[PDB]
Amino acid sequence: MELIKGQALFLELDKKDFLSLKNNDKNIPTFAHPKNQEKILAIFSLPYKNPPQNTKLIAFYKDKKEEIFIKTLEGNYKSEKLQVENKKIFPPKTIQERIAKELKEANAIYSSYTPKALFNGAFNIPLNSFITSDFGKARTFNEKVASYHSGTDFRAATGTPIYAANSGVVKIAKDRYFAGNSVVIDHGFGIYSQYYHLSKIDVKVGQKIKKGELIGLSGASGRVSGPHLHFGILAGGKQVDPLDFVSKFNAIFQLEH
């Protein structure tokens, strides 16, 4: 198998007699295939930064042991230049305490695995506009700081209504230094959708949110070159190409009427 860095894969395995799926010493969680009752699924993601060159997964069965080899592909990501406020790439010392606390809070949330589906069928795109900055662009801020784009940006004037891409539970709903006003939704199975730089937040932590429900208004809060919506997906423990992930998820979990 081959996988571009920064993307997720849905691995399909036999359900009968399955015992565990591991990557080195790390157990990878599994969930039921919604269509095929003889199969289970697992999400495997490669990070954009510092992925391994190769991966060997091992699936253990009562009477089988299967090694699965995945080659990391570099992809064809391009570069872009952005101008932002200097304090958003070199934050004052008075602010680094908040940045560290916000980082620790987010790490805690993403390690809190929900072993059931909170979603309802396929994901929607949270905005009906167009991509202005695609996932994985290699970025330079102010000709000084290298970065990479960990989500996808959509055109949005300040005040554009933003709707939940799928049903789930709100885990973050507050102003953060870099992301600005942020909403993060747990959809189950380690899948989180992220909505950043908002001007207004319309949900609160712990809220059960349904697909298509208003979660806030787009803005220009946080580290920005101008107003837009940043949409992200964390899955398999990594930030992944969100629209690529949604296409792969929907191919499995979409429903009819």
Ligand SMILES: [Zn+2]
């Ligand atoms: Zn972005």
